[PDB]
Design a protein around this ligand. Structure first.
Ligand SMILES: [Mg+2]
Ligand SMILES: [Mg+2]
Ligand SMILES: [Mg+2]
Ligand SMILES: [Mg+2]
Ligand SMILES: [Mg+2]
Ligand SMILES: [Mg+2]
Ligand SMILES: [Mg+2]
Ligand SMILES: [Mg+2]
Ligand SMILES: [Mg+2]
Ligand SMILES: [Mg+2]
Ligand SMILES: [Mg+2]
Ligand SMILES: [Mg+2]
Ligand SMILES: [Mg+2]
Ligand SMILES: [Mg+2]
Ligand SMILES: [Mg+2]
Ligand SMILES: [Mg+2]
Ligand SMILES: [Mg+2]
Ligand SMILES: [Mg+2]
Ligand SMILES: [Mg+2]
Lengths: 82, 129, 80, 150, 123, 205
RNA sequence: UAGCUAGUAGGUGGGGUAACGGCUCACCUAGGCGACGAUCCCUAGCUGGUCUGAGAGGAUGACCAGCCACACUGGAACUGA
RNA sequence: CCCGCAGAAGAAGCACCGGCUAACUCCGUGCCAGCAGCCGCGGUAAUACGGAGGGUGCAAGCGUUAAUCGGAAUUACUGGGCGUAAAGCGCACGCAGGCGGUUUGUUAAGUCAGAUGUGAAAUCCCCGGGCUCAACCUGGGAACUGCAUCUGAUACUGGCAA
């Protein structure tokens, strides 16, 4: 089943995830279908750190896909609208 | 053996010029004409002339400015052995702009200045500066 | 249609095993000169009719025989 | 704004009954900085004599070339004896990059921002010379109109 | 010349022989001393140059130069050899890495000690 | 990393003052500048175009106390950055904290001014920056840390800092011992006696 | 290395496969490929790209990603989406 | 990452200096010992051997070797040559192949135009943002100079016809 998950393209001790749709059986940082956000867990208070193309995501979710524990978490944190 | 007429033009010119010769003749053809035009229009020669019906005959009047001739260099660029075709964005500009390149497009035989404006491409016949 | 080629026959002499030539012209990717790159194709024609030297129109179908993935669509000229 | 510089100084041999008699040769280039450049050769039994006897030759023997502000108008090729030289306008960033020996003529000439390379022999006496005639044959970024317009 | 010609038979780039079959591009190879010679050099020069023939780990048997002044190197000595001809000894195309395996460093060298494998003498 | 040897020896060979003993005295002497960088130092080096090309960049290098590696990169950068390679070189070269430290007069020599940096006793827009090559930029503000403020060296330092031409693109204080990098130094600031397009030519072939 | 090719190339019918198919078979046709390089020999995983070069090019295919292939060597299937 | 503590305290080496190539003297040696990327240094004043003092270049690396491209326009498409330097088959005929005077019509494959899809991400590059800087990490563009379908244009090339 196709899933949305955190591919991790960080850097030793400074992780930075590419959130991505893909064939669940593929390598973490491997073949995906499309990128649908990113999540910088260092981001910091400054500005950006969790851009998330909600439109596509919840279209794949409807399309059939499913979501990581740690991705859905970013969504009921991003709030959704405001 | 007369397998490239356009080269023979380019050269009947080139030579006749270097031989400070006022006139120049040759058998004609629509293609010769369309070029003689551009050569006159862009002003590398005084004026042309085709005298005959059965066996037409281009005639070109060579310009000379100071002691020199006006045509500093006339060179084939496409040819039977090896043909050339640049698009529009890839058309050549001779002498950085000065002088010009004859090019046949689907909308007639123009210069690069022209074709660029026309927005299209063709077979770059020759260069002339 | 969805695309289609032409090209002269070259061989009719086999029970619907028609073969068609397809000459092109292409820039030599290194020396500019345009040269002739031919393509032969094993095309199906039922009730054998296309003849050696006939120009003919051709379309691409599913695999008929090992070797055949094209059928004819029309004919064009004969008696070369 | 005198501006001058020698490019290559060399030794040569004559050979006579008594042995080899040596001598030297300088090749130089003087330019005003705004077009106008000439080269002089000149040779003499000793070096200073020859490098000076050269500088002068250049002061005479001086062409002038139609610049276009800091640069050439179009690209040009030059070709004397075994040297085939090529140099190009180059919408300056820095420029003046070229085969030291034709960098010589190019800077005194006043071009400020060109790229060049020398093909064939880099025989100085023929490059600085091939380039001169090069710049020379170059032509009026306007008075091609002279030729034409008409 | 012709475009046809070039089309028929394309231009081909002269491939480069090495000058040092230290087989497959190898920084150096190990070998055993078949002979410890000292022959004399060519035309202008005149000397008694120390060399040796070495059977290499890889089969090749080749003469290599022993740099420096003096060396305990004999038949059966296990040495290392690197590129580097010696124009004077025609047919000598390799040098022996003084200070490697069983090759001593030049004694008492103070200058350029890293070539001629010599350790920093105690200050 | 840091040169570390005799400082004047350099100025002598490079033929000019490099302000490496920058401190008290002026217009050297009390040294011997010129006529003997070594045993044959007197002899005139009728030196090649490569020679001069080499020494100019070497001069600029002995000046800011930078090694080939970094310097080569500075060039690499300048070249990338739009507009005249040779100038950007100098720009970059000046944006160096340690330099902006000495320039603001917190250190006699560029070296001293650098040791200052290395010893977390300096602060860009607030926080400590203990690395010499930190790039300073418009509006940035460097200041000596209270911890070791008005201490021996830096007094004298800020002192003969006015003995010097005193910059322009920046604004010292001397009380709060802070200073503001107003603008990227223009070409026309500094130099004259340094000839970029040589050290350009050098790294250009 | 200049000729290669009997399931070979095609047709018809049965069989077959998740599927089109000489995939298999039986019969019929005598075809099919090739100097635009077949066949044979030698070398080789391909790509995104990498290094170089002003470019055009040249060289290259570690590390990252994609595809393929292999799992002691040769062969076979079983289970199962 | 922050704070205090002690003492400059624990922390410089490698190649080179005849020319190309930045850096020169003495002593030892004497076609020996030896150097050597190329040229070439060594037979009594050796800046070229070896040591020394000096100097230049690098610097936690420095040199040597190996290796690809570069400069090499030295396989030349861009971008070369063949009288005497490497290079015109001893000569002719001619199949294939390449190229082919001139005019009109038609064709629209080459050629040209536009539209659309596609050209994975990373990488490269441009402007940014994040690690004290930097390497590194990262947002967004740009670029992927290619391919394919459709529609056009018809001067030039190809086909066709006379
Ligand atoms: Mg004369
Ligand atoms: Mg370092
Ligand atoms: Mg069947
Ligand atoms: Mg293999
Ligand atoms: Mg090049
Ligand atoms: Mg791995
Ligand atoms: Mg098996
Ligand atoms: Mg099964
Ligand atoms: Mg020198
Ligand atoms: Mg040595
Ligand atoms: Mg002596
Ligand atoms: Mg090349
Ligand atoms: Mg040649
Ligand atoms: Mg000959
Ligand atoms: Mg003959
Ligand atoms: Mg014609
Ligand atoms: Mg991409
Ligand atoms: Mg930053
Ligand atoms: Mg036609």
């Amino acid at each position: 089943m196709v899933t949305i998950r955190l591919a991790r393209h960080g850097a030793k001790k400074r992780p930075f995830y590419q959130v991505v749709v893909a064939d669940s059986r593929n390598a973490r940082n491997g073949r995906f279908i499309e990128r649908v956000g990113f999540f910088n867990p260092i981001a910091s208070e400054k500005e950006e750190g969790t851009r998330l193309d909600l439109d596509r995501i919840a279209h794949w979710v409807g399309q059939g896909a499913t979501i990581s524990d740690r991705v859905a978490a970013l969504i009921k944190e991003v709030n959704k609208a405001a | 053996s007369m397998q490239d007429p356009i080269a023979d033009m380019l050269t009947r010119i080139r030579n006749g010029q270097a031989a400070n010769k006022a006139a120049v003749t040759m058998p004609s053809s629509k293609l010769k004409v369309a070029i003689a035009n551009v050569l006159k229009e862009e002003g590398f020669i005084e004026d042309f002339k085709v005298e005959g019906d059965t066996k037409p005959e281009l005639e070109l009047t060579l310009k000379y400015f100071q002691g020199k001739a006006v045509v500093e260099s006339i060179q084939r660029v496409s040819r039977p052995g090896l043909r050339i075709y640049k698009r529009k964005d890839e058309l050549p500009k001779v002498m950085a702009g000065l002088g010009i390149a004859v090019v046949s497009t689907s909308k007639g035989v123009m210069t690069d200045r022209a074709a660029r404006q026309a927005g299209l491409g063709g077979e770059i016949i020759c260069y002339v500066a | 249609k969805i695309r289609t080629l032409q090209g002269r026959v070259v061989s009719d002499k086999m029970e619907k095993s028609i073969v068609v030539a397809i000459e092109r012209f292409v820039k030599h990717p290194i020396y500019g000169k345009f040269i002739k790159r031919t393509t032969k194709l094993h095309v199906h024609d039922e009730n054998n009719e296309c003849g050696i030297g006939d120009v003919v129109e051709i379309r691409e179908c599913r695999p008929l025989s090992k070797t055949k993935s094209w059928t004819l669509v029309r004919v064009v000229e004969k008696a070369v | 704004e005198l501006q001058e510089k020698l490019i290559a100084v060399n030794r040569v041999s004559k050979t006579v009954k008594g042995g080899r008699i040596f001598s030297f040769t300088a090749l130089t280039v003087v330019g005003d900085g705004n077009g106008r450049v000439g080269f002089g050769y000149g040779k003499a039994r000793e070096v200073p004599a020859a490098i000076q006897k050269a500088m002068e030759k250049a002061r005479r023997n001086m062409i002038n070339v139609a610049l276009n502000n800091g640069t050439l108008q179009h690209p040009v090729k030059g070709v004397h004896t075994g040297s085939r030289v090529f140099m190009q306008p180059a919408s300056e960033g820095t420029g003046i990059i070229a085969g030291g020996a034709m960098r010589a003529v190019l800077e005194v000439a006043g071009v400020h921002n060109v790229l060049a390379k020398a093909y064939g022999s880099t025989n100085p006496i023929n490059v600085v010379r091939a380039t001169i005639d090069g710049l020379e044959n170059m032509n009026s970024p306007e008075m091609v109109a002279a030729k034409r317009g008409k | 010349a012709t475009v046809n010609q070039l089309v028929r038979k394309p231009r081909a780039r002269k491939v480069a022989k090495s000058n040092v079959p230290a087989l497959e591009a190898c920084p150096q190879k190990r070998g055993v001393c078949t002979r410890v010679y000292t022959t004399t050099p060519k035309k202008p020069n005149s000397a008694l140059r120390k060399v040796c023939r070495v059977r290499l780990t890889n089969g090749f048997e080749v003469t290599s130069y022993i740099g420096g002044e003096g060396h305990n190197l004999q038949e059966h000595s296990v040495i290392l050899i690197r590129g580097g001809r010696v124009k004077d000894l025609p047919g000598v195309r390799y040098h022996t890495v003084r200070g490697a395996l069983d090759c001593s460093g030049v004694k008492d060298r103070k200058q350029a000690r890293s070539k001629y494998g010599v350790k920093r003498p105690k200050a | 990393a840091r040169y570390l040897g005799p400082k004047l020896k350099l100025s002598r060979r490079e033929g000019t003052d490099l302000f490496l003993k920058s401190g008290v005295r002026a217009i050297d002497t009390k040294c011997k500048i010129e006529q003997a960088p070594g045993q044959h130092g007197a002899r005139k080096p009728r030196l090649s175009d490569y020679g001069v090309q080499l020494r100019e960049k070497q001069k600029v290098r002995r000046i800011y106390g930078v090694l080939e590696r970094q310097f080569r990169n500075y060039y690499k950068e300048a070249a990338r950055l739009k507009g005249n390679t040779g100038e950007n070189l100098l720009a970059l070269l000046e944006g160096r904290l340690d330099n902006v430290v000495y320039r603001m007069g917190f250190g006699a020599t560029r070296a001293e001014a650098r040791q200052l940096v290395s010893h977390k006793a300096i602060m860009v827009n607030g926080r400590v920056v203990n690395i010499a090559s930190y790039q300073v930029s418009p509006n940035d503000v460097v200041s000596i840390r209270e911890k070791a403020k008005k201490q021996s060296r830096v007094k004298a330092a800020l002192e003969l800092a006015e003995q010097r031409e005193k910059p322009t693109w920046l604004e010292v204080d001397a009380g709060k011992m802070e200073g503001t990098f107003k603008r990227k130094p223009e070409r026309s600031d500094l130099s004259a006696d340094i000839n970029e397009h040589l050290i350009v030519e050098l790294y250009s072939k």
